Specification:
Helix content: under 10%
Number of domains: 1
Radius of gyration: 19 Å
Number of helices: 0
Structural class: mainly beta
Largest sheet: 3 strands, antiparallel
Protein name: Obscurin
Strand content: 25-35%
Order of helices and strands: EEEEEEEE
CATH superfamily: Immunoglobulins
Family: Belongs to the protein kinase superfamily. CAMK Ser/Thr protein kinase family.
Subunit structure: Interacts (via protein kinase domain 2) with CDH2 and (via protein kinase domain 1) with ATP1B1. Isoform 3 interacts with TTN/titin and calmodulin. Isoform 3 interacts with ANK1 isoform Mu17/ank1.5.
CATH class: Mainly Beta
Organism: Homo sapiens
Subcellular location: Cytoplasm, Myofibril, Sarcomere, M line; Cytoplasm, Myofibril, Sarcomere, Z line; Cell membrane, Sarcolemma; Nucleus
Length: 110
Protein backbone atom coordinates (compact mmCIF):
# COMPACT_ATOMS: atom_id res chain seq x y z
CA UNK A 1 0.00 0.00 0.00
CA UNK A 2 2.26 2.77 -1.28
CA UNK A 3 1.70 4.86 -4.41
CA UNK A 4 4.79 5.26 -6.56
CA UNK A 5 7.15 3.39 -8.88
CA UNK A 6 10.02 0.98 -8.22
CA UNK A 7 10.93 -0.26 -11.68
CA UNK A 8 11.48 -4.02 -12.07
CA UNK A 9 9.02 -6.74 -11.04
CA UNK A 10 9.17 -7.87 -7.41
CA UNK A 11 7.82 -11.09 -5.91
CA UNK A 12 4.71 -9.82 -4.13
CA UNK A 13 3.97 -13.37 -3.00
CA UNK A 14 6.91 -15.68 -2.33
CA UNK A 15 6.46 -19.42 -2.86
CA UNK A 16 5.31 -21.49 0.12
CA UNK A 17 7.18 -24.58 1.32
CA UNK A 18 6.11 -27.75 -0.49
CA UNK A 19 5.45 -31.20 0.96
CA UNK A 20 4.46 -34.30 -1.01
CA UNK A 21 5.25 -37.99 -1.49
CA UNK A 22 7.22 -39.70 -4.25
CA UNK A 23 5.43 -40.03 -7.58
CA UNK A 24 3.43 -36.86 -6.96
CA UNK A 25 3.93 -33.54 -8.74
CA UNK A 26 5.17 -30.75 -6.48
CA UNK A 27 4.54 -27.25 -7.84
CA UNK A 28 5.28 -23.77 -6.48
CA UNK A 29 2.73 -21.04 -7.18
CA UNK A 30 3.95 -17.47 -6.79
CA UNK A 31 2.97 -13.97 -7.91
CA UNK A 32 4.91 -11.01 -9.31
CA UNK A 33 4.26 -7.27 -9.06
CA UNK A 34 4.03 -7.17 -12.85
CA UNK A 35 4.42 -9.48 -15.85
CA UNK A 36 8.13 -10.32 -15.93
CA UNK A 37 10.47 -13.19 -16.89
CA UNK A 38 11.80 -15.49 -14.16
CA UNK A 39 14.15 -18.44 -13.69
CA UNK A 40 13.83 -21.36 -11.29
CA UNK A 41 17.02 -22.91 -9.91
CA UNK A 42 17.73 -25.61 -7.32
CA UNK A 43 20.63 -24.39 -5.21
CA UNK A 44 23.32 -23.96 -7.86
CA UNK A 45 21.54 -25.43 -10.89
CA UNK A 46 19.41 -23.53 -13.40
CA UNK A 47 16.29 -25.36 -14.56
CA UNK A 48 14.53 -24.75 -17.88
CA UNK A 49 11.03 -25.90 -18.81
CA UNK A 50 11.36 -29.20 -20.64
CA UNK A 51 9.75 -32.59 -20.06
CA UNK A 52 9.85 -33.03 -16.28
CA UNK A 53 9.62 -29.38 -15.23
CA UNK A 54 6.37 -27.92 -16.57
CA UNK A 55 6.78 -24.15 -16.26
CA UNK A 56 3.57 -22.19 -16.80
CA UNK A 57 3.29 -18.45 -16.22
CA UNK A 58 -0.07 -16.73 -16.73
CA UNK A 59 1.37 -13.22 -16.82
CA UNK A 60 2.27 -12.21 -13.27
CA UNK A 61 1.68 -15.69 -11.85
CA UNK A 62 4.35 -18.38 -12.13
CA UNK A 63 4.06 -22.16 -11.76
CA UNK A 64 6.84 -24.76 -11.73
CA UNK A 65 5.59 -28.35 -11.67
CA UNK A 66 7.78 -31.43 -11.25
CA UNK A 67 6.72 -34.65 -12.97
CA UNK A 68 7.94 -37.66 -11.02
CA UNK A 69 8.77 -36.64 -7.46
CA UNK A 70 11.83 -38.48 -6.14
CA UNK A 71 13.26 -38.38 -2.62
CA UNK A 72 16.41 -37.12 -4.35
CA UNK A 73 14.63 -34.11 -5.85
CA UNK A 74 14.24 -32.90 -2.26
CA UNK A 75 16.09 -29.60 -2.02
CA UNK A 76 15.75 -25.82 -2.11
CA UNK A 77 14.35 -24.20 -5.25
CA UNK A 78 14.81 -20.50 -6.01
CA UNK A 79 12.99 -18.45 -8.65
CA UNK A 80 15.01 -15.43 -9.77
CA UNK A 81 12.79 -12.67 -11.15
CA UNK A 82 14.66 -9.68 -12.55
CA UNK A 83 16.01 -8.22 -9.32
CA UNK A 84 13.94 -10.13 -6.76
CA UNK A 85 14.19 -13.85 -6.01
CA UNK A 86 12.04 -16.28 -4.02
CA UNK A 87 13.01 -19.61 -2.48
CA UNK A 88 11.36 -22.53 -0.68
CA UNK A 89 11.87 -26.05 0.65
CA UNK A 90 10.49 -29.15 -1.07
CA UNK A 91 10.22 -32.20 1.19
CA UNK A 92 9.70 -35.46 -0.69
CA UNK A 93 8.72 -38.42 1.48
CA UNK A 94 9.25 -41.97 0.21
CA UNK A 95 6.19 -43.83 -1.06
CA UNK A 96 3.84 -45.37 1.55
CA UNK A 97 4.94 -48.92 2.33
CA UNK A 98 2.00 -51.34 2.15
CA UNK A 99 0.92 -52.53 5.60
CA UNK A 100 -2.13 -54.57 6.60
CA UNK A 101 -3.73 -53.20 9.76
CA UNK A 102 -6.78 -55.23 10.79
CA UNK A 103 -9.51 -52.75 11.70
CA UNK A 104 -13.29 -52.44 11.46
CA UNK A 105 -15.25 -49.29 12.32
CA UNK A 106 -17.77 -49.60 15.13
CA UNK A 107 -21.46 -48.74 15.66
CA UNK A 108 -20.33 -45.20 16.44
CA UNK A 109 -21.71 -42.62 14.00
CA UNK A 110 -19.08 -40.01 14.77
Amino acid sequence: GSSGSSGPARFIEDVKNQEAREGATAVLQCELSKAAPVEWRKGSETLRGGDRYSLRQDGTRCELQIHGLSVADTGEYSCVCGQERTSATLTVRALPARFTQDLKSGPSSG
